């Protein structure tokens, strides 16, 4: 699209409509973009000394990108609630994007006095990496997505990436991608950039919780017909004499019943409690946390494989890195106290996946014989096994929406671990930069790189609309399901509202599983 | 096909052409075939005493088979190089085979003097087991495939197979397949045997190395928004008092960052070093090597599941059985010294799969509490887990090309472990035998089995052409990729050449990953 | 072309005719071919010490080649004379080649006594490097072309070539061409191999 200077390049679309089966969440926000790295690509690396587990090598670019991989960039409390309360599941189908009403300003810091003014002509160029030839950054839970609250103006993030490294230094194989080596489209004012995408058949996120659970799944009333090993030894006057007898598992017997499927896999996490007291006093934050390691650098295992966060009656506990944790609007960056964060809870799964903090089961160790007692041992890490079945990490309104499946020789069940939809070809990276403006050059020629540009930034609005599909409920469940509600009682502030000084804020994390489906 | 005696049953096709997307490697070689087991099927078994882990039972047949399950039976250094240097990947599509110019000779060892002459009439019969009713031997890394070097004449291997066994003895279930119970086609001279095959949709072998790696994958510039557990206890005058605080992972924080996928699986191997010194002195060749075991016989775990062979800066090490090892042209059969072999290296993977010699990660053991320190333990064997992603063993010019997927109730990701393409219905076994020639029978009848045949063997050439598909490169990588080159400096002998006495020889193993794709 | 065992795969053409403007010199000769390097490619180099101006590195092949880059393989004194006496100049235009009546024998040196006999089946394979992917040896004034005199039987030369070298040793850039990496056509007896060529506009040799 194209037009004039006194012509709005696009209108403001920010609705949300439900169609019974679909529902489209349109949404627009105003943004701003500075000139990063003063227009140059800069090489960047870990700090020489820095622990090995923390080295790196890569580049930062003068390019800034766009991102809305956060559910709340599309759903509004209320809306989300609608969804989350009457749908067995849902998934994204297609999207449409558009930047417009772009405007380029140029600040002038003459002595003690700045003065911003329109640089009409100068441009901002955009380009979408629709061929995925660029290090996909999104999906890395970074923060600089869209504001949950419309009215909020925002700054565009700067693109940076990482290649290979042998400590703080580069290794040859590492590649250096240059963003100008693409065909950016250049916008001036009166210019807009639209583009549209279509998702790929993915599974509806399961937005329901299970009423039955693996173990308790058969019918009480009837005993099976298969037998199991009831007792081993037997009374012989005073002493026992080994004599194995078997029984037919019934209701009273349950624990012993024969089955057909196994809980999901696991990778044991340390348990910490919301109650300061209980927790051993010391620094096992890193030392005790569950991790894995590549090329000799141990990394953390955050968002551990999807597994319930606490047994019955222990909402007080949680994994050291088995859950998602968001900050309460305002919460500072580092070492903030428990009271400043919102920890997610995944009890809803208990029913199928193991509890993060407790071992999977316990396999037998030795082979018993008359002169040898029967061994056994608990298992803290069980990789996928036939017959296992499980549930993936719920979603949360202010959580990630999707993530790119890495291009590898092999993947195994790609639901992104941080939760979300695992996409092979996700929404392409959208980039934006401000074509430089060489400030006054010298009369006599010089072949040096230009270094003195006009100080200036850009701004303008952006809009994103997405169509989601739904799987409606359908249970013959007689008694009421659970629903997500807002507290009745009076409060000094409404949830998901602007305070007295107009600061919007999300009180709690809102999950997705409320409706109840049987297993 | 058919014709006369003074008529070449086929010409010599040994080209190789590239078409941009495909590339066909035609190739012909001269061969020779003796008469095995003096024409009879012989029962064969382990040596009574022999360690249990080494028993067996099966048969050897008078039949010899054909095989080219080695990349170099089709690619010529140069060619291979072309491929390997400009292609994100490739795979086989179809093939065509033909035997021809068959000729049957008959030696005469009259006293101190042999004398070979043409037995025109007598025949050689061939037959392809296109229904896979015969124990698929190929794929077992046996040696008797085609000569890498054209000019080389070769001997055809003899077919043998193995069934069940209870120690050195047979067990009933074990089957005994007889090769005459097939409809062999009989060739006399002037007769040729052609046949063609078509591969099945398989995945292009990934012939590229990764520039990013699982851990270092997100964007440096921006800190995430999810929080993790920074510290546990806290300064209380003199003493620490447990007080968990959380942080928001950033660049400096990296190791702690939240992610979305896990390294490939693992099965720990012992580390040995190319440097004699380091290595503990003793015999842990078997005792210390990683293995598995069926029906009480521990077998070795060679070509362990695909996993990088050494961390940064340790090209000197390697798994005890985690790598492929070829002999330097000439190297004898047993206990040959390190200097006689070429060990393959799979560093290229590091980026996704674990290091063979070092544990996967480390899970937590106990549950900590005030009166209990936080436990933890390293894991040396991790079975596939959701979110895991990885790369398969590279290929190597003189490596296997494919392998038959065993007919079972269940397989899991069939890329053959020794590397190659996992095929459900691979190129059918091709067999060949020389119809016997009863040497002079007695005038008076006898119903005994004939035992005195004419001494004779066969020869003639064979040709195999195969069409491979390619996936061309396509990265916006600015700086040069790595390529495979031959050393500039002078040398007494060219690599992949015949020495002074015309002995062709492959200097080093050549992999496949050189081109660099991002993860 | 193809046929049987008791069938001459080609006749003997050895004429020479003048047409006023053209003149065609046909010519046939009998030849023989041993098995070189006992069937293998052998690496070959100057003699370590040997003056520098005389070092080299290259290979010898089990392959033998054909050659008639000598005017007398086509002209007969007399003929040549005709030409040479009444022509301001001349040049070649096209050619046609054919091998035939191929026969494979096999000697038997049993003790103090050899005995040659027909190995009917066995073959001889031929192939023309029509894409010039092989080190062009001919033109190097080598000797093993055709006999000037028809009646003369001859032996076929063996193919060998030279690459780069840093003294008596090889240098990487040097290439090693393998003759089997071509699609040889295989002849058995009763088999013939013909092929034809066409020269390119060249200047008449000034014969005045």
From Swiss-Prot, chain C:
Tell me where in or outside the cell this protein is found.
Virion; Host nucleus, Host nucleolus
Q: How is it used?
A: AAV capsids serve as viral gene transfer vectors that have been shown to affect long-term gene expression and disease correction with low toxicity in animal models, and are well tolerated in human clinical trials.
Reading the lineage from the top rank, the first entry is Viruses
Q: Domain description from the entry?
A: The N-terminus of VP1 is sequestered within the mature capsid. It contains a phospholipase A2-like region and putative nuclear localization signals.
Q: What else is known?
A: The ratio at which VP1, VP2 and VP3 proteins are synthesized in vivo is about 1:1:10, which is the same as in the mature virus particle.
Q: Which family does it belong to?
A: Belongs to the parvoviridae capsid protein family.
> What's the protein here called?
Capsid protein VP1
Q: Where does this protein come from, organism-wise? A: Adeno-associated virus 2 (isolate Srivastava/1982) (AAV-2)
Q: Which gene encodes it?
A: VP1
Which residues of the whole protein does the chain here span?
Answer: 217 to 424 of 735
């Amino acid at each position: 699209g194209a037009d004039g200077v006194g012509n709005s390049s696009g209108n403001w679309h920010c609705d949300s409509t439900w169609m019974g089966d679909r529902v489209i969440t349109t949404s627009t926000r105003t943004w701003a973009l500075p000139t990063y790295n003063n227009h140059l690509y800069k090489q960047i690396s870990s700090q020489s000394g820095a622990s090995n587990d923390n080295h790196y090598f890569g580049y930062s670019t003068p390019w800034g990108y766009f991102d809305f991989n956060r559910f709340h960039c599309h759903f509004s409390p209320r809306d989300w609630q609608r969804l989350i309360n009457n749908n067995w599941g849902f998934r994204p189908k297609r999207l449409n994007f558009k930047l417009f009403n772009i405007q380029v300003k140029e600040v002038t810091q003459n002595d003690g006095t700045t003065t911003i003014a329109n640089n009409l002509t100068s441009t901002v160029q955009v380009f979408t990496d629709s061929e995925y030839q660029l290090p996909y950054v999104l999906g890395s839970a970074h923060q600089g997505c869209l504001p949950p609250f419309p009215a909020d103006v925002f700054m565009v993030p700067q693109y940076g990436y990482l290649t290979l490294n042998n400590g703080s230094q580069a290794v040859g194989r590492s590649s250096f991608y240059c963003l100008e080596y693409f065909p950016s489209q250049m916008l001036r004012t009166g210019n807009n950039f639209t583009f549209s995408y279509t998702f790929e058949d993915v599974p509806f996120h399961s937005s329901y919780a299970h009423s039955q659970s693996l173990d308790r799944l058969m019918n009480p009333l009837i005993d099976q017909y298969l037998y199991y090993l009831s007792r081993t030894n037997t009374p012989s006057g005073t002493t026992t004499q080994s004599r194995l007898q078997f029984s037919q598992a019934g209701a009273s017997d349950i624990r012993d019943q024969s089955r057909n499927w196994l809980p999901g896999p696991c990778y044991r996490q340390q348990r910490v409690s919301k109650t300061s007291a209980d927790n051993n006093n010391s620094e096992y934050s890193w030392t005790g946390a569950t991790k894995y390691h590549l090329n000799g650098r141990d990394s953390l295992v955050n968002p551990g494989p999807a597994m319930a966060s606490h047994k019955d009656d222990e909402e007080k506990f949680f994994p050291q890195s088995g859950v998602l944790i968001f900050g309460k609007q305002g919460s500072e960056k580092t070492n903030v106290d428990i009271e400043k964060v919102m920890i997610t809870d995944e009890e809803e799964i208990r029913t199928t996946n193991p509890v993060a903090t407790e071992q999977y089961g316990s396999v037998s160790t030795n082979l018993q014989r008359g002169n040898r007692q029967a061994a056994t041992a608990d298992v803290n890490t069980q990789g996928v096994l036939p017959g296992m079945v499980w549930q993936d990490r719920d979603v949360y309104l202010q959580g990630p929406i999707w993530a790119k499946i890495p291009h590898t020789d092999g993947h195994f069940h790609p639901s992104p671990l941080m939760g979300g939809f695992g996409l092979k070809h996700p929404p392409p990276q959208i980039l934006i930069k401000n074509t430089p403006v060489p400030a006054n050059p010298s009369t006599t020629f010089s072949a040096a790189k230009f270094a003195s540009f006009i100080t200036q930034y850009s701004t303008g609005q952006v809009s994103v609309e997405i169509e989601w599909e739904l799987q409606k409920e359908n249970s013959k469940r007689w008694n009421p399901e659970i629903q997500y509600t807002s507290n009745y009682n009076k409060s000094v502030n409404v949830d998901f509202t602007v305070d007295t000084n107009g600061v919007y804020s999300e009180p709690r994390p809102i999950g997705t599983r409320y409706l109840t489906r049987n297993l």
